[PDB]
Amino acid sequence: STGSATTTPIDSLDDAYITPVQIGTPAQTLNLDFDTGSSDLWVFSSETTASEVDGQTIYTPSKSTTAKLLSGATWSISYGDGSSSSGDVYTDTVSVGGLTVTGQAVESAKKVSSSFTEDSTIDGLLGLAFSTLNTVSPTQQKTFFDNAKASLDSPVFTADLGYHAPGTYNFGFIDTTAYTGSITYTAVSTKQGFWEWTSTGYAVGSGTFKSTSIDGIADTGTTLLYLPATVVSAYWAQVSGAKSSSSVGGYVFPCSATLPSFTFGVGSARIVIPGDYIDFGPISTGSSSCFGGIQSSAGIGINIFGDVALKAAFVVFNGATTPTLGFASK
């Protein structure tokens, strides 16, 4: 089997991407944030505290003939940005882009933090990291990908995120029309439960490439590119007037700037992030200070190849017995 679903930016900054997902019988379609940095499939639901729902579409398990309470199971998750959610668990039928999993754990939110409430466009998350990070207790549950894997033509999914445009998540096949040149594959460590890999270095603009190992995660659920302070300082030093602002929470730059590109290495291959992808616009409405899309990972504890980086590439998440990651230009 295979699946193919379009993923769409939630706003004009590509802050996140939503993908329609069918849950239950008859289908209830919710728009979920596919997150390769976590491993819980959770949704706004008929159980979510009313005051914490503001425009989201909810899953109502009592209206699904295939929903079953997973008795005794609870979940609770905290994300890197400080947001959180928790609740109980149902199993139900879940379909993505024509690919169906029966018996998928659907984690129903009883509580969500303010950032979720405030984002009316995101009805929940669909985790695509390794199932060892799943938070369901006392019986840990498998991700949608893990459950689908044995049925897939090939044990892979791909992320093809757009810049200010829709893109695609495919399951079970590699669309050879969706990228240019060849795919370069690189080793993955699953020790922390992430799609963790080591970039071979970077360049700023038309500058020379610096060969240096940068360990980080491929994380579709993180907006920006978070890298070591040395790397980030070297990038922003090439933008007149750019500075790190503790009051704003990172690097800002004059909105009158033309940003240089940023290149990262994948083995001997190179992925180029155009300068425009690094512009996250005014820090507040009407400001002439703009927020940067490359930020320091210092104090996160991990480097994160978030959407800013991933959307510059066609990315293969290879879930074969020895997982790997592939990157191609597009």
Side-chain angles (χ1 to χ4, degrees), residues 190 192-215:
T190 63
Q192 294 191 89
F194 300 120
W195 293 93
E196 186 170 1
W197 65 290
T198 303
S199 172
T200 49
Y202 70 100
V204 177
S206 61
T208 59
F209 187 84
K210 177 69 169 181
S211 293
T212 186
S213 293
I214 305 171
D215 289 347

Side-chain angles (χ1 to χ4, degrees), residues 62 64-67 69-109 112-141 143-148 150-190 192-242 244-307:
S62 65
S64 173
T65 60
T66 43
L69 182 71
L70 187 61
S71 183
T74 58
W75 62 280
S76 180
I77 194 162
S78 299
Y79 297 100
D81 68 353
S83 65
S84 65
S85 52
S86 63
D88 56 15
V89 188
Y90 293 82
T91 55
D92 210 338
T93 302
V94 172
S95 301
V96 177
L99 169 67
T100 300
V101 168
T102 58
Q104 175 64 46
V106 177
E107 300 171 37
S108 167
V112 303
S113 62
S114 56
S115 52
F116 290 115
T117 298
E118 289 160 3
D119 194 350
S120 65
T121 65
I122 292 174
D123 301 325
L125 267 63
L126 189 150
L128 292 167
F130 293 89
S131 292
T132 53
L133 292 180
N134 176 267
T135 77
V136 178
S137 181
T139 308
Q140 189 173 56
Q141 302 293 304
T143 69
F144 176 82
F145 178 53
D146 211 340
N147 282 324
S151 303
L152 295 178
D153 292 356
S154 180
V156 304
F157 68 91
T158 65
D160 181 9
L161 303 180
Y163 168 66
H164 294 346
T168 306
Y169 281 103
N170 290 329
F171 292 83
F173 73 106
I174 287 160
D175 180 357
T176 59
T177 73
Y179 61 88
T180 58
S182 55
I183 306 176
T184 300
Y185 289 87
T186 194
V188 165
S189 173
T190 63
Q192 294 191 89
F194 300 120
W195 293 93
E196 186 170 1
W197 65 290
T198 303
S199 172
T200 49
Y202 70 100
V204 177
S206 61
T208 59
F209 187 84
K210 177 69 169 181
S211 293
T212 186
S213 293
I214 305 171
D215 289 347
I217 66 168
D219 185 1
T220 58
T222 290
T223 313
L224 306 185
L225 174 52
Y226 294 87
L227 292 170
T230 47
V231 176
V232 176
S233 181
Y235 178 81
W236 290 109
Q238 298 304 310
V239 180
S240 295
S244 183
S245 169
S246 55
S247 58
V248 175
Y251 282 90
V252 296
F253 68 92
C255 224
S256 58
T258 300
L259 296 177
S261 64
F262 184 89
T263 301
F264 64 94
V266 183
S268 58
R270 308 286 181 254
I271 300 294
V272 181
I273 305 172
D276 291 345
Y277 289 26
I278 299 161
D279 176 19
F280 279 74
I283 60 171
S284 297
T285 305
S287 179
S288 70
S289 184
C290 273
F291 196 69
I294 296 177
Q295 296 295 344
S296 178
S297 64
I300 292 175
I302 197 159
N303 300 306
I304 306 174
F305 293 86
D307 298 334

